[model samples]
Target: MKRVLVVDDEESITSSLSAILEEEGYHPDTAKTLREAEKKIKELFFPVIVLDVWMPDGDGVNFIDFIKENSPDSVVIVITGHGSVDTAVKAIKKGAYEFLEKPFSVERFLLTIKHAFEEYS
Candidate 1:
């Protein structure tokens, strides 16, 4: 199974996304902040990560850069309630796999994730 890290400040969002990813057959782990996320990234190997841009300690952009510099093979997706076209452009330029705006359809989220972790079997 593909491993995934889902990071969000909102427990509810992380819970929902985790459930959905689990249902889709991914091994989903979660973190509530950038600090927690950095720990998880260091401890495990995830093929893909879904991260929230706004957090109490810092923005997901920081995590995005970490992933870029440390785990280039892994794909990073940014989930933002405050996402704008400009933000998406910047994130993509900085190596984010995808940028998802909040209130996004679960269907869309699932599709984007599936594409990011393209299955082999």
Candidate 2:
């Protein structure tokens, strides 16, 4: 199974994403904060990461930069309710696999993940 790390401060979002990833035949790990996410990534590598912006502690974009520098092959998908076109473009320029606006349906989420997985594969 492909491992997926999902980082988001919202419990409901993380829980829902975890369930969706499992349904899509992925091994999903949920992290409620950037610190937890960093620890998880350090312990076990994941092929794909689904992250949220505007956490209490740090910026998601910085995490994207870390993944870019250290895990160049990893695919990152940023999903944020507060996303703007500028942010999406910035993420793409910064090497994110995709940027998804929040309130996305499960179908859209699956589609984005599938696309990123294929691209990285």
Candidate 3:
């Protein structure tokens, strides 16, 4: 099974996404912060990552850049509650595979993951 990272400060979001990813046959890892994600990425390469757009310690664009530079093979799915168009644009330019707004459907989530990871298969 491919490894996937789900990053969010809220346990609820991480837990839910992790469970869903696992059920979909991926080995899922959870990170409560971008710093935690950076540490995890240093140790292992996740083929797909679900990252929150606004983190307490960092912003989206640089974080996406960090992921792109550190794990170029990975495809990112950015989730944002803010819904700012400029942020989405920046994130996509920074190498996000897809952008998801808050309250996104589970179907949308899986579809995004499936589509992004499809290139690997």
Candidate 4:
């Protein structure tokens, strides 16, 4: 099964996304903070990652650079409540697969993950 890391400080977000990803046949893992996500990333290889931008510990924007440098094979899909063209552009330039604005449709979320898998594969 494909492994996916779902990183979000919001418990509900991580829980819901993980449930959906698991139902779609992906092995989904959840991390509630950037530190946890970083530890998980170092410990395992995930073909795709769903990352939230704002968090208490650290901003996901900063971690995009780290992921590109350290886990180049992993495709990152950024999710942010404070969506802006500037942030999206920065993330794309830093090598994110896509940027998802908050309150996105479930279909869009699933489609993005599927597309990331195809692109990474």
Candidate 5:
């Protein structure tokens, strides 16, 4: 199974994405904070990451570099409720594979992941 790491402070977002990603046939591992996600990244390699922008612990926008430092080849898709061009550009420059806003459609989510994998392959 393809391992995916999902990081979000919101329990509902983490849970929903986990279930949906699993249903789509990916092995979804979730974290409620950046620390937990970092630990997971240290322990295992994930091809794909679904990350939230703002968390109580740390900003996901800043964490994009951390992700690339640890997993250079991993594809990161940043999801944010507070989306802005500046933030999106920063993430893209820092190596995020894609940027998405909250309330995005499930079809778009799946398609993004699919595109990431295709590009990676």
Candidate 6:
């Protein structure tokens, strides 16, 4: 999830999220930035994608269109601290399955994951 899909991010939260995913016997495939995520989808397709848009790259919400272009059947979930109701609405309009504001709780995050999988996968 690094600039090269090397797997990096908000060490505290991203690490915890992946750890939780691993605890549930899930593969926590991660991308630290937009470039990494984009580079990743070229070879693989995920039924659900968890995205963080606060980065040096362009608008992460807009990246939803890019993700959709490559994986049309995929679901995109956005996680961000740099947003508001308008940003959340914008993300939904673009194609995100869920727009999770920061300080997201573990239970709610897991719930979103489960719901997305159940709804799509």
- Across 1-121, the per-residue lDDT of candidate 4 in tens digits comes to 6777777777745535655776788877877887888888886877887777544667667888777766788888876664566878777778888676543444466777777778567
lDDT per residue for candidate 2 within 23-64, as digits (tens), equals 778877778887888788876767787777645567666677
Clashes of each: 0, 0, 0, 0, 0, 3
Q: At residue 84, what lDDT does model 2 achieve? A: 73
Q: lDDT per residue, candidate 6, 2-120, as tens digits?
A: 11111234553363575567556665667667677788877776767777644454566667788789977777766655557787777777877766554344445566776666644
Cα RMSD of all models vs. native, in order, equals 2.6, 2.3, 2.3, 2.3, 2.4, 4.6
Q: lDDT score of model 3?
A: 0.72
Per-model TM-score, in order, reads: 0.80, 0.81, 0.82, 0.81, 0.81, 0.76
Q: Is 1 or 3 the stronger prediction by TM-score?
A: 3
- lDDT digits (tens) for residues 2-120 of candidate 3: 66787777664553565576678877787778888889888787888878744466655778988889888888887756447777777877788757654344446776777677767
Off by over 4 Å in 6: 1-9, 12-15, 101-106
Off by over 4 Å in 5: 12-16, 101-106, 119-121
lDDT for 109 in candidate 2 is: 67
Pairs that collide, model 3: none
What is the Cα-based lDDT of residue 68 in candidate 5?
A: 89
Which segments of candidate 2 are over 4 A away from where they belong? 12-15, 119-121
Report the Cα lDDT for candidate 5. Answer: 0.73
| Tens digit per residue, CA lDDT, model 1, 80-104 | 6655677676776788875665444
Which candidate should be chosen as best, given TM-score against the real structure? 3
Q: Candidate 4: deviation at residue 81, Å? A: 2.4
Judged by TM-score relative to the true structure, which candidate is superior, 3 or 5? 3
